[PDB]
Structure 1
Amino acid sequence: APTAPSIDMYGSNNLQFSKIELAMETTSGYNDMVKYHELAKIKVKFNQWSGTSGDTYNVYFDGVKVATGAITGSQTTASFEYGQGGLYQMEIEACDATGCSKSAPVEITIADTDGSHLKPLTMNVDPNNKSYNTDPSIVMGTYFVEWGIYGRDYTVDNMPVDNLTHILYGFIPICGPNESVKSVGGNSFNALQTACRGVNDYEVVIHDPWAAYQKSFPQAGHEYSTPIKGNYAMLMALKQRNPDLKIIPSIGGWTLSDPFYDFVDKKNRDTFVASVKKFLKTWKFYDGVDIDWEFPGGGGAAADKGDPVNDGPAYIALMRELRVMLDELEAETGRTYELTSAIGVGYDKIEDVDYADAVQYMDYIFAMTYDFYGGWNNVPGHQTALYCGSFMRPGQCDGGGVDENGEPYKGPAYTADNGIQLLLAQGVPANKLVLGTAMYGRGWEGVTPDTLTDPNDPMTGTATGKLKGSTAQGVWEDGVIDYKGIKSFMLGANNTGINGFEYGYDAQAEAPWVWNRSTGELITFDDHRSVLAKGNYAKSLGLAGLFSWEIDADNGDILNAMHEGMAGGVVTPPN
């Protein structure tokens, strides 16, 4: 028999092969950093110094023959291609007419972006996240933000994944006009310039490749030489742990929506839809696409953009075209892909899209039932209420009234029910709507008791400016505080108020607040009671479920209340 092959581990690159080439100690254009191959190129060097070498080799993975080739004297390189990622026990055999001889087995890894080579992620979840047996039809969604791994120190293994059906990964940018990104300051706009070098306008890219796939997380077992790292390798291992979890990239958002306004031109839609197909073929752990255009018709971050006439039909065409592309991917892969969108729910946002036409292409609409009031001006109100608060004026809720100056309201007030009823009345199916919950507050200072027109209600006061605070308090920008900051600095464990704050609840609106009458600090947020109200409301109307922005800001209380308020319910999943 031939001499048994002896595998050269070092010069077969210790048997780590990857279908994706990712650039590692550099930051460059997306097309220079990311290259995906349908088949991994496997090159394994072996030698046979004593004896006869034979004529032909065979390579086996877990005892099944996967490749064959010619022996070349004393040193051969087995070269072949392989599609399926995984961990395999490889042996190499040399054969001639006298017989065959095989190497010792050795583990080969073929990395792919579905995480087929990875073990289930080890989790490190705050134990205040409790266990529920919510029916699997109900959507329990949240957004995980790519930048949460920095100051916020919240990583994929912190997510309470057994309590989630859908994770929206925020946010994938679109190359092109992106002036709005400069409003976040820092290196965000420059990082996008770098990512888009050599990329066509209106194609998707990864905004921060360090966070997405370069950074080594010791809790995930990453080493500096591991071929896929970052949040994306953790999401691939999370999918190995929880295979029914849907992980969806969210394209756009408040700061990254400026390129959508050029989708009035079909050529730019076609460039975008092709780039998304290519993205989902590259990053196989993703299960569809979420489009967060804020907003058709304008009123987002770009004051100079928005076309009430033309953006709606462009959004509908985009959805049509994306569902054609996703059906191509379902035919190619045999998988199911979801198409979703987060939308504004103010009447002036909903009137700009004919949702009765768009929703036929969509699996779910994530209704952004939050940010109704905030520190952008000095008018207090409930940022995430279901219904109209006691602070509002006669006829403000339905929009038939006049304001304090006698001027007509232009539409119904910003509440979750006004927006959900406007979507339902035009024929959007309840079972496609997912109601949003806020894991943060918005706030003001300067709301002192003398400014209140009703002394029992701080929402009738007037502010002097935004809430101010530090990042240890969960204030990452003025006017916005993490829920877990409100719990540590304003509520306390018994929910009865600390540090000079008092708790109140508008039982008509279904909306909580904390108020420090000394400083005039007032914060509008969601809490256990108001999230139980939203789940009861979702069960009453047959909505798909609930989602939240953003998971790093919860301490478990808000996701627990999302499950508690949906207990017992089931829903028909959209077809």
Structure 2
Amino acid sequence: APTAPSIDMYGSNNLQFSKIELAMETTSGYNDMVKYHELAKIKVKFNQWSGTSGDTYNVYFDGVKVATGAITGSQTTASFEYGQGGLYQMEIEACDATGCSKSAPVEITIADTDGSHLKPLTMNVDPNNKSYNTDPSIVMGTYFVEWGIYGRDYTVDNMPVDNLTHILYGFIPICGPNESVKSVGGNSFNALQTACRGVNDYEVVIHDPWAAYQKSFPQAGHEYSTPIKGNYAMLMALKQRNPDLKIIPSIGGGTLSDPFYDFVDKKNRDTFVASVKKFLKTWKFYDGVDIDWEFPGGGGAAADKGDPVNDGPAYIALMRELRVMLDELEAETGRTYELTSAIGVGYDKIEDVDYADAVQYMDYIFAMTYDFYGGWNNVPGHQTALYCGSFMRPGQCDGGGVDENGEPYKGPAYTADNGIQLLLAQGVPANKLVLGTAMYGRGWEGVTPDTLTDPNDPMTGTATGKLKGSTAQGVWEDGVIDYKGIKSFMLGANNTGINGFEYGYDAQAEAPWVWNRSTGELITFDDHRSVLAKGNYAKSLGLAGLFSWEIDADNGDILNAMHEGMAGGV
């Protein structure tokens, strides 16, 4: 017989609650911005403006009582805790000694990071991406980058997810020594220093919380009060659409690998592995972990770091210790968690790790069979070729011979086949290796015809510097160009070459190029033909599948050719 409660929607955070508390309007340390609770804190204000209020309230979700407390006046705030994400019809009842009166039901949301409160994501994929029916057991992976939402304007709902089995989210940094990040300029280091305030060294953090969970995406149905927004809320809604798609955070990458060189100390590994466990319990849409340490032994961005005696065994120990932790999560959740790693494939990188030992702990190795040549120097070559190119010298392919100064080659050439063969020779099983495809070109200026030793092959020339171009042409950093920019501005509709560029293909290497003989611009990349050759290769060797770097740079053609090539190999 009291008055039925009316729910104050605006005073109850629009009935949006969450197991994860996320700061939405600042940028601070990771431990200050992100706190995961086993029970969501619920606070609901209700009013009884007319008649009597009664003395007690009960709260129901879907008919089931979840809380009770005192009413002592005409406005009451009910505070309680609840453990399970999703959407529930809430009713609040006010009671006196004579009876109870229930409010009309209203939907409350309790966010959780598995996306249990979310509908399947609405997609907006470029229709140049075709449908395939590739065997679900073949890996078809790609990297999606956190910063691609900015100038590149490529968001989670643009991914052709039905053509993927694995999405690797690039990149999760590690707090600690990170000089390599400073050298890249822009805000990357300042963002990391901010994220790491109040965080122990060697723990993972989110690099850009605005892209990860603050930015409101209208296509995802985000509102002011939505407790999780950003790329991460869209990836959660994507798992509701595609529950078998594996979404895996990639830790490190070329500029964020400096802290790994301190993993020779096991206490730093222990700190890192515990931070990864907490991260996967905080962000439950993730299905494992991908380690992108570039590179054990060195030769990467940190010129002053790298230990070829100890980094190998440390990498192996880290995989073993991650697999231990992941087994604990599997035991706790009843889920399967995957452990993978993207690795360098030059002989001088592979020689520093016993991968047959490491891979026993791992589901897949993503062989980075790209970046073999590029604008960091003026020597052209195929950056992602399967085999040795026509431009190579006698003895250069297998490392038997000498360079132009007569100095012995130190090891076999940088090609995808040389890397895969070295890894098989160590005893890595073929069915754990994933072959990489580039959705980008690398390139140079100044490779003009007077510099060539073979007049029909620009790979025999000499550059003056890195390729330059505008972001309108897909050039986001000197020396690199999106595949879709090569296609729009250099190849043209017919693949015969436009804007002063001509197309060529080195059939021995399985590698395309475009070359502008007057500016000397020369770009090495992957195309439909070379990607079919890679798929025929992967199928011949019984590799696990193919993956690509990075998805925003494709227009459909490369991912289509990945599926075609895997269907089509002979």
The alignment's TM-score, normalised by the length of structure 2, stands at 0.97
Q: 1:480 to 1:18 in 2, by over 3 A?
A: same
d(CA) in 1 for partners of 2:476, 2:74: 64
Question: Could you tell which deviates more after superposition, 226-235 or 287-296?
Answer: 226-235
d(CA) in 2 for partners of 1:150, 1:55: 54
Q: C-alpha deviations, 1:367-398, integer Å up to 9, x for none?
A: 00000011111111110011111111111111
**Contact 2:29–2:198 (Cα < 8 Å) also in 1:** yes
**Contact 1:484–1:554 (Cα < 8 Å) also in 2:** yes
Report how far residue 80 of structure 1 moved.
Answer: 2.4
Q: 1:49 to 1:452 in 2, by over 3 A?
A: closer
Question: SS in structure 2 opposite 1:119?
Answer: coil
**Contact 1:175–1:199 (Cα < 8 Å) also in 2:** yes
**Contact 2:13–2:225 (Cα < 8 Å) also in 1:** no
Report how far residue 442 of structure 1 moved.
Answer: 0.7
Q: C-alpha deviations, 1:224-256, integer Å up to 9, x for none?
A: 332211111111111112111111111100000
Residue 141 (structure 1) aligns with: 141
Question: SS in structure 2 opposite 1:515?
Answer: strand
Q: C-alpha deviations, 1:147-188, integer Å up to 9, x for none?
A: 111111111111111111111111111000000012221111
Q: 1:470 to 1:75 in 2, by over 3 A?
A: closer
Question: Could you tell which deviates more after superposition, 92-101 or 231-240?
Answer: 92-101
**Contact 2:365–2:434 (Cα < 8 Å) also in 1:** yes
Question: Could you tell which deviates more after superposition, 22-31 or 93-102?
Answer: 93-102
d(CA) in 1 for partners of 2:65, 2:165: 39
**Contact 2:175–2:201 (Cα < 8 Å) also in 1:** yes
Question: Could you tell which deviates more after superposition, 486-495 or 43-52?
Answer: 43-52
Residue 69 (structure 2) aligns with: 69
Residue 238 (structure 1) aligns with: 238
Report how far residue 289 of structure 1 moved.
Answer: 0.7
Q: C-alpha deviations, 1:459-497, integer Å up to 9, x for none?
A: 111112111111111111111111011001110011111
Report how far residue 277 of structure 1 moved.
Answer: 0.8
Report how far residue 353 of structure 1 moved.
Answer: 0.5
Alignment of 1:364-443 (within 5 A): 364-443=364-443
Q: C-alpha deviations, 1:108-128, integer Å up to 9, x for none?
A: 011111111122222211111
1:496 has 2:490 as partner: no
Question: SS in structure 2 opposite 1:566?
Answer: helix
**Contact 1:5–1:102 (Cα < 8 Å) also in 2:** yes
Alignment of 1:74-473 (within 5 A): 75-95=75-95, 98-473=98-473
d(CA) in 1 for partners of 2:356, 2:343: 14
Report how far residue 311 of structure 1 moved.
Answer: 0.2
Q: C-alpha deviations, 1:513-542, integer Å up to 9, x for none?
A: 111112211111000000011111111111
Report how far residue 93 of structure 1 moved.
Answer: 2.8
d(CA) in 2 for partners of 1:330, 1:518: 59
**Contact 1:7–1:44 (Cα < 8 Å) also in 2:** yes
Question: Could you tell which deviates more after superposition, 227-236 or 252-261?
Answer: 227-236
Q: C-alpha deviations, 1:306-365, integer Å up to 9, x for none?
A: 000000011001111111111111111111111110000000000001111100111110
Q: C-alpha deviations, 1:194-237, integer Å up to 9, x for none?
A: 11111111111111111111111222222333221111111111
Q: C-alpha deviations, 1:37-76, integer Å up to 9, x for none?
A: 1110112233445566556543222233333445556554
d(CA) in 2 for partners of 1:239, 1:343: 27
Question: SS in structure 1 opposite 2:10?
Answer: coil
RMSD between aligned residues = 1.7
Q: C-alpha deviations, 1:436-479, integer Å up to 9, x for none?
A: 00000011122112222222211111112111111111111111
**Contact 2:144–2:167 (Cα < 8 Å) also in 1:** yes
d(CA) in 2 for partners of 1:345, 1:513: 22
d(CA) in 2 for partners of 1:360, 1:68: 53
d(CA) in 2 for partners of 1:441, 1:2: 72
Report how far residue 141 of structure 1 moved.
Answer: 0.8
d(CA) in 2 for partners of 1:51, 1:426: 81
**Contact 1:312–1:352 (Cα < 8 Å) also in 2:** yes
**Contact 1:134–1:568 (Cα < 8 Å) also in 2:** no
**Contact 2:16–2:225 (Cα < 8 Å) also in 1:** no
Report how far residue 568 of structure 1 moved.
Answer: 7.0
Question: SS in structure 2 opposite 1:567?
Answer: helix
Q: 1:468 to 1:11 in 2, by over 3 A?
A: closer
Uncovered stretches (5+) of structure 2, i.e. residues with no partner = none
d(CA) in 1 for partners of 2:464, 2:477: 17
Report how far residue 98 of structure 1 moved.
Answer: 4.8
d(CA) in 2 for partners of 1:94, 1:190: 52
Aligned-residue sequence identity (percent) comes to: 100
Q: 1:295 to 1:33 in 2, by over 3 A?
A: same
**Contact 1:171–1:253 (Cα < 8 Å) also in 2:** yes
d(CA) in 2 for partners of 1:538, 1:453: 33
d(CA) in 2 for partners of 1:76, 1:152: 49
Q: 1:491 to 1:49 in 2, by over 3 A?
A: closer
d(CA) in 2 for partners of 1:132, 1:10: 47
**Contact 1:155–1:231 (Cα < 8 Å) also in 2:** yes
**Contact 1:44–1:79 (Cα < 8 Å) also in 2:** yes
d(CA) in 2 for partners of 1:70, 1:404: 88
Question: SS in structure 2 opposite 1:264?
Answer: coil
d(CA) in 1 for partners of 2:542, 2:153: 36
The alignment's TM-score, normalised by the length of structure 1, stands at 0.96
**Contact 1:55–1:95 (Cα < 8 Å) also in 2:** yes
Question: SS in structure 2 opposite 1:95?
Answer: strand
**Contact 1:135–1:568 (Cα < 8 Å) also in 2:** no
d(CA) in 1 for partners of 2:141, 2:516: 32
Question: Could you tell which deviates more after superposition, 217-226 or 46-55?
Answer: 46-55
**Contact 1:402–1:408 (Cα < 8 Å) also in 2:** yes
Report how far residue 20 of structure 1 moved.
Answer: 1.4
Question: SS in structure 2 opposite 1:11?
Answer: helix
Residue 572 (structure 1) aligns with: none
**Contact 2:61–2:90 (Cα < 8 Å) also in 1:** yes
d(CA) in 1 for partners of 2:480, 2:470: 11
Uncovered stretches (5+) of structure 1, i.e. residues with no partner = 570-575
**Contact 1:126–1:556 (Cα < 8 Å) also in 2:** yes
d(CA) in 2 for partners of 1:479, 1:222: 37
d(CA) in 2 for partners of 1:137, 1:94: 56
Question: Could you tell which deviates more after superposition, 227-236 or 198-207?
Answer: 227-236
Q: 1:146 to 1:408 in 2, by over 3 A?
A: same
Q: 1:51 to 1:223 in 2, by over 3 A?
A: closer
d(CA) in 1 for partners of 2:10, 2:225: 14
Residue 549 (structure 1) aligns with: 549
Report how far residue 99 of structure 1 moved.
Answer: 4.4
